[PDB]
Amino acid sequence: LMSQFEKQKEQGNSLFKQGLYREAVHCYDQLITAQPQNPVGYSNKAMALIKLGEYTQAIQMCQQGLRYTSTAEHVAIRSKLQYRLELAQGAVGSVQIPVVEVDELPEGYDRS
C-alpha cells in the first residue's frame, strides 16, 4: 500500500491534474514538512505555484529544492527543478534581494 507520504503526494498530484493548484500546494507543503530533504515536494510545489502565477515563490521553492539534488541519484529531479527555476526566473526578470541591517558583520565574513 502507499505510505502516508506517498498518499499525500498522490492526492496533491490528483488535485494538480484537476487544476486545483492551491489545494495541490497545500498537499505538497505537507510533503515538505514531513521530508524537508526530499526534492519532490519542492519540485511539485514549484510547478503548482507556477500554474498559479506565483513565480517569485516558485523560484524560492526551486532554490530550496536544488540544495538536495547535487548527487547523481537526483539528476532527473534536478532537471525538473532546473526547468521550473528557469521558467520562473524568466517570468519575473528579477527578484528582490533582502538587506540585513546589522551592528557588525556576523562571524565568517571577511572585513579585511
Partner: peptide, 7 residues
Amino acid sequence: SRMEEVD
C-alpha cells in the same frame, strides 16, 4: 510528457 508533469 515530462518537464511539465509533477512527480
